[PDB]
Amino acid sequence: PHSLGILHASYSRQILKDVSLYVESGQIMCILGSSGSGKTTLLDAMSGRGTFLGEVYVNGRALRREQFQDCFSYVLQSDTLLSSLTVRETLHYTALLAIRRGNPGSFQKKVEAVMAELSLSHVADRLIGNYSLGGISTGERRRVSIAAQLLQDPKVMLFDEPTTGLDCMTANQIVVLLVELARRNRIVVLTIHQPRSELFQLFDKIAILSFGELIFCGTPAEMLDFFNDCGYPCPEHSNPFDFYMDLTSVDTQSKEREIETSKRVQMIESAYKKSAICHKTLKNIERMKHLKTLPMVPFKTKDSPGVFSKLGVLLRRVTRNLVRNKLAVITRLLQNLIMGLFLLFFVLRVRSNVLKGAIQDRVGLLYQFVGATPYTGMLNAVNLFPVLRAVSDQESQDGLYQKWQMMLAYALHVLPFSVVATMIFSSVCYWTLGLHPEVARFGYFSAALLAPHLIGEFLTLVLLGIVQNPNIVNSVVALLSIAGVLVGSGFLRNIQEMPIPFKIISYFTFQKYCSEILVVNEFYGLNFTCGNPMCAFTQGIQFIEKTCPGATSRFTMNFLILYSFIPALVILGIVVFKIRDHLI
Amino acid sequence: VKLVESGGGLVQPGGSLRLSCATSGFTFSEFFMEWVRQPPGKRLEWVAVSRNEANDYTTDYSASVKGRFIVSRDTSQNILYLQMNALRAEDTAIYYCARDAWMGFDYWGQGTTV
Amino acid sequence: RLFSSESDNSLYFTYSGQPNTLEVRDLNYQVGIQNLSFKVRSGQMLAIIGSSGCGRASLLDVITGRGKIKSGQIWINGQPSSPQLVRKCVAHVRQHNQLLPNLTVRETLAFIAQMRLPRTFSQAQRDKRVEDVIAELRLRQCADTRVGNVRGLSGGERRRVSIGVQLLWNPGILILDEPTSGLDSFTAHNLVKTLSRLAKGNRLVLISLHQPRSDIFRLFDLVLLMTSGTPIYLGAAQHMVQYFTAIGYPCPRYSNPADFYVDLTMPGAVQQFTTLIRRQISNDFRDLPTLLIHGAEACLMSMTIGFLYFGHGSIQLSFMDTAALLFMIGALIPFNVILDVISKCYSERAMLYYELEDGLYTTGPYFFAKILGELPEHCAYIIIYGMPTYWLANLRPGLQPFLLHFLLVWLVVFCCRIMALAAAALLPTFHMASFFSNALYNSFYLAGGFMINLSSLWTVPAWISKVSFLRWCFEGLMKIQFSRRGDKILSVMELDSYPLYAIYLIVIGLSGGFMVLYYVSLRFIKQKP
Amino acid sequence: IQMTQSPSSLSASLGERVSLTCRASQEISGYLSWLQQKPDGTIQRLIYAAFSLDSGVPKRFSGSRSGSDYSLTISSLESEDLAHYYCLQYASYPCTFGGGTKLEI
Ligand SMILES: CC(C)[C@@H](C)/C=C/[C@@H](C)[C@H]1CC[C@H]2C3=CC=C4C[C@@H](O)CC[C@]4(C)[C@H]3CC[C@]12C
C-alpha cells in the first residue's frame, strides 16, 4: 500500500511551522483552517510549487523538491475550461499533451475509462459552454477537471477547496466522489472552508491548521475523544466541524480576545503534541521509512512529447475551440469590414478630380486605416486570448506544456483569420472608395493594412502576457496606436520638420512605414485639378515628395521592416511569457 | 438636575447596607443611573448601572461586585437604591450617584462614605 | 463560552411608537414560493433559513415588492403592502455595501441623517441621532476612521455602518439580506448578537441567512425553514428539533439542525442638492490616486501635443501643421474623458440606484449635484491640458485669443463629459456604454472639418457635423487663430459660415441637449447594476 | 482601555495656565470627558466630548487633541480651580477613568 508522510515541514513571515502528516492509500484526509491558517501553502509545498524545510517521504523514499510535480496531482478551484469544446475532445487533448503511445485507440480507451470512472459518459459528446446558458453543470466541470488530472494515472491527489463555489448537493456529491476515488487505492488530501455535518464521518483523517501550526490530525472518533479529554466536549447539534473550528481559531476583534484565543489554541496544540496521536504518526512515518519493503514511488504515466508535437496539438485544440464559436469568428472576420463600412458611410468616394477635398479625404482615409487596423487587432486579442491565457497558466504548472508554446499557437491560428478578414475588408472597400483602381495596388494596399493588424494583435498579446487586466491593456494599446499614427505618419507633422526626439521615435513605429507605403501606392500615378493656396499639388508626386520625399525608393524596404517588426513582436511575446511563467 | 446621596454609615464586613440616591429635576424613567465609588488610594471605579424604562430596567455590575451588589429604583419616588451585601472587604469608598455613563458622566452627586 | 461575552447589553437607540406587524397570508410566487404564511410582530427576530429566493430576487425582496407575480397578500402594520408604505415603514440592508470609501463613519451618518431626517429637525437633534446610532451599534471606536473598502474599516464594521445608515431614520421594520456574508465566525456572531439586541427593542427584524454554522442558529428567536419554496417549520429555533422528533424525523447527534433539516428537504430639493454635492466633493477630493492619475493623463497628453507641434526654434509651424494641431487638441481628449467618466459612473451605479429606490433624493438634485461636483476637477483638467499647450506650440500671441481658445476647449470637453454621462445613464453595462460612446466619438471625429472637408458629405454626415462638437471646436479654433491676420485661408475652406459667438452658442446648445438626454435617462431608466 | 493621566500632581498660582494630558491605550474617537471634583466632595463634569463645555462652566476651560493625547487647558487660573481632575473614556465598555491630577496652589 502506498503511503505519504510529511515530516517537520516549514515554510517562510513564517507560513508553516513544523507540520507533520501521514496518509495511506485508501484513506482521504481533509484539512481545515482559518483565513491565515496556511493550508493552501501546505498543499502547494506538497505539490512542489521561499525556503522550504522538512521532508516528504512517498512509499518510504524521500522525494526531492524537484520530484513533487511528477508524483502529486493538484486540482484547483478555478476550473478554467474551454467553452467551445466537448468533454471527450478536451480529455483527448489532455491525453495527447500528457501521453504519447501510438494509434488513437489507446487515448480513446483512456478517455473512456476516465469518463466511466467519474460518470462522464453521458456528457462525453456535449459542449462544455457555460452552466447558466445550456452547458454542463458545475459538478460536471469539476468531474471533467478531475478526469483530466487522473488521465496521468496518479496515486496522490491534492484538492484546493473543491467544494467552494458549489451548492450543498453538488458539494456533497463531489465529496462522495473524492471518497470513492480515494477508496480505489489512492491518496486524497483535500481542503475545505466550512464542511457540513454529514461529511464528518466521511473523512478518514481530519487535520487542523492555525497560523501554520498543526493543532490536531487524526480520526474523527479520535478527534471527538481528544477534544473531550481536553475539556471541550462537542455539544449536541453543534456541527463538530464548526465547533472545533471556533475552538482552534484566533478571534481578532480585540486585543484581549486575541490573547485569550491564542492561549487556548496554544494549550490545545501542546496537548496534541503531548498526545499519543502525534507520537503514533511520527512512529508510522519512521516505520514506513525504515521498512525497506514498500514498493517504489508511483510516478506519472509517460514522458512529455516533443515541442513540435505539443505545439501542433495546442494549435489544433485552439483552432477547434475558435471555429466552433460563431461569435468569435464573426468578430474576427468582420471587425475590419465594419470599420471600412463606417468610413465609407462618411466618405462614399474620393474626389481625386478636384483639390477641394481630394488630398484631404485621401489623407483622412489612410490615417483612419492606419489607426484602426491595430485597434481591431487589439480588440480581437483582448476579447479572445484571456481564457486561453488562463487555461495555459492552469495547465503549465501540471507539466503539460509551456505558455510561450500556447502563445505561438495562438499567433499561428490567428494568422489566417486575420489574412482573410483583411482581404475581405479590402476587396469590399478599396474598389468602392475609388482609390487608384488597379490590382497590384490593391494587393499592396491589402498587405500594407494586413501587417499592422497582426502587429497590434501581437503587441496586445505581449501586454496581456505581462499585464493581467484586459481593460488596462486595451487602453494602453489604444493610446499607443493613437500616438504612433500621430507621430509616425507624416500626415500631420511633416516628419522632416518635427523635433529630433519625435523624429527618432517615428523610426521605431510601424505607422511611419505603413503610411509611406500607402502614400507611394495611392499618390503615385494620378493627377488633380481645381477647375495657389492648396493647388500647388496638382500632381501626386509633389505631395509624395512633400510628405515623404524618398519613400518611392523604400517600398520593399518598408515592407520588409513591417514583416520583420511582426516576428520581433512574436519573439518578444515568447520572452514575455517566459518571464510570466517564472513570475506568477 | 439634583442628585443627593444618603445612607452611608459604619458597617464592618459581614453585614449589609442599602444606599439611597434622591434624584430630582428630570424624568427619572428616561435616563440611566450609575453608582461609581472612589476608594482612598484608587482613582475611580464604576460599580453598577441601572438602565432606563426603554431597557425594561435591567441592571449591570462590574466584575469586582458582580453577585454581591444589587441596584434598583423606585419609579414612583425617583430614588436609586444600592444594596451591598458582604461588603467592606475592600469596598470602603465615597460612592457617587451619576446619571449617564454612555453620554459622559454628568450631574454627579456628593458621595457617601462607607 | 468560546465567543466574546464581555460586552454592553444596553439599548441606546430604541424605537418609540406603535409596534409594527408583518403578516403574510398564502403567499404564492412563480417565475417557486407556495402557500407561505407567517405573522411576525415587533420585538421578534425572524431568520429565514433554507433555499429561499427563486431567481434574481430573494424572499425578502418578494415581501417588500421587488422582483415574478404574486398571488397572495402581504400586510404592513395592518394595511396592505404598497410601494410607498414599504419605503415608509421598512428599511432594507442588502448583502453588498454601497458606501463612499473616502468618508468616515461620522461623516457618512451625518450626511444620511441630513438627507433623511425632516427639515424641522435641529442640527443638535441630527447630531444626537447620529450619536445614538453610533452608540447603539458600538461604533464609537470607529467614528473617526474612513469607510474605505484603501485601509478603511473591517468587514463587520462596514456592515454595522450600513445598518446604521439604514437605521438613522428610526425604522419600525428592518430586513437584512445575508448580513453575515463574508464575515469571520466571531464577527458574524457579534453581528447576530447586535441584530438580536436591535430586535430586543420595539423593532421587527427579519434576516435572510442560508447556512448558520451551528452558532448563529442558537441565537435565532424565530426561524422559518424553506425547502424549494415551501415552508416546513415556523416557530422558535430551540424547539425546531423537537418539532421534528415528535413527527418521526429525529436529528442525529453531532449534526447541525439547520443543515440536517435543509438536506432532508422635507427636507427639500435644494437641501438635497447641497448635501449631495457636499458629500460628492468630500469623497472625491480625498481620492489622491484618481486625481493624480487624471492629472498625469492631462499633463502627458498636453506635453506630447505641445512638443510634437513645438512652434519655437528654427522653423515655425505651417498652416496645415497648425490645422492638424488644432484638430488634435480638439479630438484627443474625448478618449480619456469618456473612459474616466464612464468608469466613475459605473463605479457608482449601485449606490445611486439603491438611494433612488429608498427615496433619499428625487433624481432631480442628483443631476445638478453630479454636474457641479464634476465641474472643479474638469476645470483643473482643462487648465492642465490647454494652458501648457497654447504656449508650447507658439500660437497667436495675446490675451483675448488665448482666453477664447481656453473657453472653447473647456466648453467642448464639458459637452463631451455630459455626453459620456448620458451614455452611461442610458445603457446598463459598462461595455455597451463604452461602445456607444466610442461610436459617437468616431462619428463626430469623421464629421470634423479636417479630414472630409465638410463638403464631401451628402445629407447625413453633413447633419452629423452640424451636431458634432469636435467640428465646431475645430472651426472655432481656426477662426481664433486665422481670422484678422488672414481671412482668405478661412474662406477657401468652409470655416467662415458661422461667427465665433454663434459657435459658442451652438456648443452651449449641444451641451444643453446632452444634459436633457442625461436627465431623462436618469429619470426614466432604472440604473440597475 | 487604560487612561494614563499626567501629571498626578501639579502646582501653580493665579494668572497661570495649566495643561493636563490623558493618554488612551486604544482609539476613543474623542469620546472623552473631563471631570472636576472639588475638595468638599462635589463632582462636576467640566468638559464632554473632549471639546465641548457644559452649561454653567467658565469659558476658560478648553479641550485639545494632540495625536493620541487629550489635553484639558485651564487659562487664567483662579483660586476656585484647586480640585481634583479626572479624564474618562466612554467610547468602549466598560467605562474606565483616568489616574487623576491634583491641581495645587
Ligand atoms: C472593476 C475594476 C477592474 C474596474 C472598475 C477598473 C477600472 C479602472 C480602475 C481601470 C480600467 C481602465 C484603466 C485605465 C485606463 C487608461 C489609463 C491611461 C494610462 O495612460 C494609464 C493607466 C490608465 C489610467 C488606467 C487606470 C486604471 C483603469 C482606469
Author numbering:
A (entry chain A): 35 to 46, 66 to 102, 107 to 588, 597 to 649
B (entry chain C): 21 to 134
C (entry chain B): 26 to 56, 87 to 122, 126 to 207, 210 to 325, 392 to 611, 626 to 669
D (entry chain D): 22 to 126
Q: What does the primary publication say about this deposited structure?
A:
Cholesterol is actively excreted from cells by two ATP-binding cassette (ABC) transporters, ABCG5–ABCG8 (G5G8) in the liver and gut and ABCG1 (G1) in macrophages. Members of the G subfamily of ABC transporters are encoded as hemitransporters and dimerize in order to function. G5 and G8 heterodimerize before exiting the endoplasmic reticulum and trafficking to the apical membrane, where they mediate excretion of cholesterol into bile and the intestinal lumen. G1 is abundantly expressed in macrophages and exports cellular cholesterol to extracellular acceptors, especially HDL.
The structure of G5G8 purified from Pichia pastoris was determined at 2.7-Å resolution. A sterol-like density was observed in site 1, which we assigned to be ergosterol, the most abundant endogenous sterol in yeast. To break this pseudosymmetry and capture the sterol-bound state of G5G8 in solution, we developed a series of monoclonal antibodies that bind human G5 or G8 in its native state. Fab2C7 binds the nucleotide-binding domain (NBD) of G8 and restrains the conformational changes required for ATP hydrolysis.
